Design a protein around this motif. Sequence first.
Motif, PDB file in Angstrom:
ATOM      1  N   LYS A  11       5.659  -4.644   3.104  1.00  0.00           N
ATOM      2  CA  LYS A  11       5.779  -4.168   1.726  1.00  0.00           C
ATOM      3  C   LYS A  11       5.014  -2.861   1.521  1.00  0.00           C
ATOM      4  CE  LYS A  11       7.916  -5.133  -2.097  1.00  0.00           C
ATOM      5  NZ  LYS A  11       7.200  -4.345  -3.138  1.00  0.00           N
ATOM      6  N   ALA A  12       4.842  -2.099   2.596  1.00  0.00           N
ATOM      7  CA  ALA A  12       4.008  -0.908   2.591  1.00  0.00           C
ATOM      8  C   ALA A  12       4.886   0.332   2.583  1.00  0.00           C
ATOM      9  CB  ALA A  12       3.070  -0.893   3.800  1.00  0.00           C
ATOM     10  N   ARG A  13       4.613   1.232   1.645  1.00  0.00           N
ATOM     11  CA  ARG A  13       5.338   2.489   1.522  1.00  0.00           C
ATOM     12  C   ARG A  13       4.439   3.680   1.827  1.00  0.00           C
ATOM     13  NH1 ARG A  13       6.011   3.739  -4.654  1.00  0.00           N
ATOM     14  NH2 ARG A  13       4.181   2.414  -4.292  1.00  0.00           N
ATOM     15  N   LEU A  14       4.808   4.420   2.872  1.00  0.00           N
ATOM     16  CA  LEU A  14       3.951   5.437   3.477  1.00  0.00           C
ATOM     17  C   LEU A  14       4.693   6.769   3.469  1.00  0.00           C
ATOM     18  CD1 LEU A  14       3.272   2.529   4.842  1.00  0.00           C
ATOM     19  CD2 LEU A  14       2.090   3.887   6.558  1.00  0.00           C
ATOM     20  N   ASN A  15       4.020   7.817   2.995  1.00  0.00           N
ATOM     21  CA  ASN A  15       4.567   9.169   3.013  1.00  0.00           C
ATOM     22  C   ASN A  15       4.189   9.865   4.313  1.00  0.00           C
ATOM     23  OD1 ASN A  15       6.341  10.658   1.419  1.00  0.00           O
ATOM     24  ND2 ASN A  15       4.717  11.999   0.640  1.00  0.00           N
ATOM     25  N   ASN A  16       4.271  11.194   4.326  1.00  0.00           N
ATOM     26  CA  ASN A  16       3.947  12.017   5.485  1.00  0.00           C
ATOM     27  C   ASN A  16       2.687  11.520   6.179  1.00  0.00           C
ATOM     28  OD1 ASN A  16       6.015  13.619   4.299  1.00  0.00           O
ATOM     29  ND2 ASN A  16       4.468  14.800   3.173  1.00  0.00           N
ATOM     30  N   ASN A  75      -3.823  13.027  -0.694  1.00  0.00           N
ATOM     31  CA  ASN A  75      -4.155  13.833   0.475  1.00  0.00           C
ATOM     32  C   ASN A  75      -5.413  13.321   1.159  1.00  0.00           C
ATOM     33  OD1 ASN A  75      -2.092  15.461  -0.685  1.00  0.00           O
ATOM     34  ND2 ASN A  75      -3.640  16.645  -1.803  1.00  0.00           N
ATOM     35  N   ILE A  76      -5.318  13.068   2.460  1.00  0.00           N
ATOM     36  CA  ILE A  76      -6.474  12.654   3.249  1.00  0.00           C
ATOM     37  C   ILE A  76      -6.482  13.440   4.549  1.00  0.00           C
ATOM     38  CG2 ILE A  76      -7.516  10.797   4.583  1.00  0.00           C
ATOM     39  CD1 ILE A  76      -7.114   8.935   2.442  1.00  0.00           C
ATOM     40  N   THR A  77      -7.640  13.994   4.896  1.00  0.00           N
ATOM     41  CA  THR A  77      -7.795  14.782   6.108  1.00  0.00           C
ATOM     42  C   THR A  77      -9.137  14.469   6.755  1.00  0.00           C
ATOM     43  OG1 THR A  77      -6.591  16.492   4.891  1.00  0.00           O
ATOM     44  CG2 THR A  77      -7.430  17.065   7.064  1.00  0.00           C
ATOM     45  N   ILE A  78      -9.088  13.911   7.965  1.00  0.00           N
ATOM     46  CA  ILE A  78     -10.274  13.610   8.766  1.00  0.00           C
ATOM     47  C   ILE A  78     -10.107  14.366  10.081  1.00  0.00           C
ATOM     48  CG2 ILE A  78     -11.605  11.843   9.953  1.00  0.00           C
ATOM     49  CD1 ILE A  78     -10.455   9.840   7.842  1.00  0.00           C
ATOM     50  N   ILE A  79     -10.826  15.477  10.241  1.00  0.00           N
ATOM     51  CA  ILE A  79     -10.518  16.357  11.358  1.00  0.00           C
ATOM     52  C   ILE A  79     -11.563  16.133  12.445  1.00  0.00           C
ATOM     53  CG2 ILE A  79      -9.360  17.991   9.946  1.00  0.00           C
ATOM     54  CD1 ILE A  79     -11.474  19.772   9.822  1.00  0.00           C
ATOM     55  N   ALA A  87       0.837  -1.189   0.000  1.00  0.00           N
ATOM     56  CA  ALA A  87       0.000   0.000   0.000  1.00  0.00           C
ATOM     57  C   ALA A  87       0.875   1.243   0.000  1.00  0.00           C
ATOM     58  CB  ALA A  87      -0.939   0.005   1.208  1.00  0.00           C
ATOM     59  N   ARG A  88       0.601   2.148  -0.933  1.00  0.00           N
ATOM     60  CA  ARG A  88       1.324   3.406  -1.048  1.00  0.00           C
ATOM     61  C   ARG A  88       0.421   4.593  -0.738  1.00  0.00           C
ATOM     62  NH1 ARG A  88       2.004   4.691  -7.216  1.00  0.00           N
ATOM     63  NH2 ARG A  88       0.176   3.360  -6.865  1.00  0.00           N
ATOM     64  N   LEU A  89       0.787   5.329   0.312  1.00  0.00           N
ATOM     65  CA  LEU A  89      -0.074   6.341   0.921  1.00  0.00           C
ATOM     66  C   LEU A  89       0.665   7.674   0.921  1.00  0.00           C
ATOM     67  CD1 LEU A  89      -0.748   3.423   2.269  1.00  0.00           C
ATOM     68  CD2 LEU A  89      -1.936   4.768   3.990  1.00  0.00           C
ATOM     69  N   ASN A  90      -0.009   8.723   0.452  1.00  0.00           N
ATOM     70  CA  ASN A  90       0.534  10.076   0.480  1.00  0.00           C
ATOM     71  C   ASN A  90       0.151  10.763   1.783  1.00  0.00           C
ATOM     72  OD1 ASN A  90       2.306  11.578  -1.104  1.00  0.00           O
ATOM     73  ND2 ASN A  90       0.681  12.919  -1.878  1.00  0.00           N
ATOM     74  N   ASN A  91       0.229  12.092   1.803  1.00  0.00           N
ATOM     75  CA  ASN A  91      -0.099  12.908   2.966  1.00  0.00           C
ATOM     76  C   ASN A  91      -1.358  12.404   3.657  1.00  0.00           C
ATOM     77  OD1 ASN A  91       1.968  14.522   1.793  1.00  0.00           O
ATOM     78  ND2 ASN A  91       0.421  15.705   0.671  1.00  0.00           N
ATOM     79  N   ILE A  92      -1.261  12.159   4.959  1.00  0.00           N
ATOM     80  CA  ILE A  92      -2.417  11.753   5.753  1.00  0.00           C
ATOM     81  C   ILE A  92      -2.421  12.548   7.048  1.00  0.00           C
ATOM     82  CG2 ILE A  92      -3.463   9.908   7.099  1.00  0.00           C
ATOM     83  CD1 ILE A  92      -3.071   8.032   4.970  1.00  0.00           C
ATOM     84  N   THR A  93      -3.576  13.108   7.394  1.00  0.00           N
ATOM     85  CA  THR A  93      -3.725  13.903   8.602  1.00  0.00           C
ATOM     86  C   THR A  93      -5.066  13.599   9.254  1.00  0.00           C
ATOM     87  OG1 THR A  93      -2.516  15.602   7.371  1.00  0.00           O
ATOM     88  CG2 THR A  93      -3.351  16.191   9.542  1.00  0.00           C
ATOM     89  N   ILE A  94      -5.017  13.048  10.465  1.00  0.00           N
ATOM     90  CA  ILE A  94      -6.202  12.756  11.271  1.00  0.00           C
ATOM     91  C   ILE A  94      -6.032  13.518  12.580  1.00  0.00           C
ATOM     92  CG2 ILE A  94      -7.537  11.001  12.471  1.00  0.00           C
ATOM     93  CD1 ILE A  94      -6.398   8.981  10.371  1.00  0.00           C
ATOM     94  N   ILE A  95      -6.746  14.633  12.735  1.00  0.00           N
ATOM     95  CA  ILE A  95      -6.433  15.520  13.847  1.00  0.00           C
ATOM     96  C   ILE A  95      -7.476  15.305  14.937  1.00  0.00           C
ATOM     97  CG2 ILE A  95      -5.271  17.141  12.422  1.00  0.00           C
ATOM     98  CD1 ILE A  95      -7.381  18.927  12.292  1.00  0.00           C
ATOM     99  N   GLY A  96      -7.129  15.690  16.163  1.00  0.00           N
ATOM    100  CA  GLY A  96      -7.847  15.262  17.338  1.00  0.00           C
ATOM    101  C   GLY A  96      -9.205  15.915  17.487  1.00  0.00           C
ATOM    102  N   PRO A  97      -9.907  15.548  18.565  1.00  0.00           N
ATOM    103  CA  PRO A  97     -11.316  15.954  18.682  1.00  0.00           C
ATOM    104  C   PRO A  97     -11.560  17.395  19.088  1.00  0.00           C
ATOM    105  CG  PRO A  97     -10.816  14.035  20.070  1.00  0.00           C
ATOM    106  CD  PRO A  97      -9.652  14.238  19.180  1.00  0.00           C
TER     107      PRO A  97
END
Lengths: 135, 135, 135
Positions: free
Chosen positions: C59-64, B64-68, A60-70
């Motif tokens: 086998k997982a490639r993860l960015n920021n 880009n993924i954002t879950i705030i 799995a290849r994942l770009n920018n991810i942001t899960i911010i708090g409550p």
Amino acid sequence: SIDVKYIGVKSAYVSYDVQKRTIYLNITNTLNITNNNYYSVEVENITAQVQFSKTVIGKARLNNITIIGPLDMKQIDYTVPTVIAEEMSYMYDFCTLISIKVHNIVLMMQVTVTTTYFGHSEQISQERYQYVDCG
Amino acid sequence: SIDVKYIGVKSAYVSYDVQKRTIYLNITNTLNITNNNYYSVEVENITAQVQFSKTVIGKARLNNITIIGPLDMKQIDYTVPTVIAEEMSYMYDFCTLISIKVHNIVLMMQVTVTTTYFGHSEQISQERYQYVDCG
Amino acid sequence: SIDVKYIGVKSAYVSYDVQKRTIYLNITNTLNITNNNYYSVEVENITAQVQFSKTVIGKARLNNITIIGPLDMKQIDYTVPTVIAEEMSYMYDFCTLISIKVHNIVLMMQVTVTTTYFGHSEQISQERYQYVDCG
Ligand SMILES: *[C@@H]1O[C@H](CO)[C@@H](O)[C@H](O)[C@H]1NC(C)=O
Ligand SMILES: *[C@@H]1O[C@H](CO)[C@@H](O)[C@H](O)[C@H]1NC(C)=O
Ligand SMILES: *[C@@H]1O[C@H](CO)[C@@H](O)[C@H](O)[C@H]1NC(C)=O
Ligand SMILES: *[C@@H]1O[C@H](CO)[C@@H](O)[C@H](O)[C@H]1NC(C)=O
Ligand SMILES: *[C@@H]1O[C@H](CO)[C@@H](O)[C@H](O)[C@H]1NC(C)=O
Ligand SMILES: *[C@@H]1O[C@H](CO)[C@@H](O)[C@H](O)[C@H]1NC(C)=O
Ligand SMILES: *[C@@H]1O[C@H](CO)[C@@H](O)[C@H](O)[C@H]1NC(C)=O
Ligand SMILES: *[C@@H]1O[C@H](CO)[C@@H](O)[C@H](O)[C@H]1NC(C)=O
Ligand SMILES: *[C@@H]1O[C@H](CO)[C@@H](O)[C@H](O)[C@H]1NC(C)=O
Ligand SMILES: *[C@@H]1O[C@H](CO)[C@@H](O)[C@H](O)[C@H]1NC(C)=O
Ligand SMILES: *[C@@H]1O[C@H](CO)[C@@H](O)[C@H](O)[C@H]1NC(C)=O
Ligand SMILES: *[C@@H]1O[C@H](CO)[C@@H](O)[C@H](O)[C@H]1NC(C)=O
């Protein structure tokens, strides 16, 4: 959860209350009380219980991810000056107050992003609030 | 949840309350009380219980993924000046107050993004609120 | 959770309260009390219980990646000057107060990102709040 009460002044089961300037002369008070109480509160009866949580990744290849708090606070500006100019004048301040953000009761439970629960949660708050009393 | 009450001044089961300036002369009070109480509150009877949560990824390409979270504050400006100019004048301030954001009761439960529950949740609040009393 | 009460002044089971200036002359008080209480509160009956949490990568490639906590504070500015100018003048300040962010009760439980629970959680707060009393 069962017997929550808020009592202002007096709470009693059997009260022969007497007050100012009275004559309690020839009374023949008599009581006979049976007050058996049986509590079997939230007893459980369980054979099995499972809390499962799995996260499988791979190839799995994942770009920018942001899960911010409550609760996030960003760029919050409080900008309250207070300028007093007084030339040859009379000023009288009493019960003068400037308050900014302020809390009295702050209770938080299960403030997360991911949560699995099993149980019994309560929050009880009883008070006699009085913020400003000047006089 | 069962016997929630709010009582202002007096709460009693059997009260022979007496007050100002009375004559309680030849009374023959007599009682006979049987007050058996049986509580079997929320008893459970369970054979099985499962809380399952799985997240499977793979060969997945994500931008880009954002879950705030469940409350965000952004660019909130409070901009309350207070300018007083007084030349050769008389000023009288009493019970003068400027309040900004303020809370008394803050209760939060299960404030997340993902949540799995099983149980019994309560919030009880009993008070006698009085914010401003100047006089 | 069972018998939560808030009592203002007086709490009693059997009270023969007497007050100012009274005559308690020839009373014949008599009692007979049986108050058996049985509590079996939240007794458990469990055969099995499992709290499982697994995270498998490969086998997982993860960015920021950014997972931020359940309350962030960013760029919060409090900007309250207080300028007093007084030429040949009379000023009188009493009960003058400037308060900034302030808390009295701060209670937090299970403030995380990932949480698995099993049990019984409570928060009880009883007070007599009085912020400002000048007079
Ligand atoms: C009760 O008390 C009074 C006192 O004034 C008395 O005169 C009366 O005989 C009494 N009676 C009994 C039954 O005790
Ligand atoms: C008082 O209560 C008991 C409890 O059952 C009872 O046996 C009795 O007869 C009652 N009366 C007196 C005068 O004791
Ligand atoms: C459920 O009921 C009671 C407990 O409240 C107990 O006597 C009984 O054996 C329980 N049953 C099982 C299967 O555990
Ligand atoms: C998101 O990732 C890309 C890379 O593909 C990067 O150029 C960009 O700056 C990232 N976003 C932010 C807000 O940095
Ligand atoms: C009750 O008390 C009064 C006192 O004034 C008395 O005269 C009367 O005889 C009493 N009677 C009984 C039945 O006790
Ligand atoms: C009072 O209550 C008890 C309870 O059953 C009863 O046996 C009795 O006859 C009642 N009366 C008296 C005078 O005790
Ligand atoms: C359900 O009922 C009671 C508990 O309240 C218990 O006697 C009984 O065995 C329970 N049944 C099972 C299958 O656990
Ligand atoms: C979203 O991802 C792209 C990459 O394809 C990037 O150019 C862009 O800046 C990202 N969005 C933000 C708001 O950064
Ligand atoms: C009660 O007390 C008074 C005192 O004033 C007396 O006169 C009366 O005889 C008494 N009665 C009994 C039954 O004790
Ligand atoms: C008082 O209560 C007991 C408890 O059962 C009872 O046996 C008795 O008869 C009651 N009365 C007296 C006068 O003791
Ligand atoms: C459940 O009920 C009671 C405990 O409350 C106990 O006697 C009984 O053996 C329990 N059952 C099992 C299967 O443990
Ligand atoms: C995200 O990762 C890319 C690399 O592909 C990098 O260029 C970029 O600066 C990162 N984002 C931030 C905000 O640094």
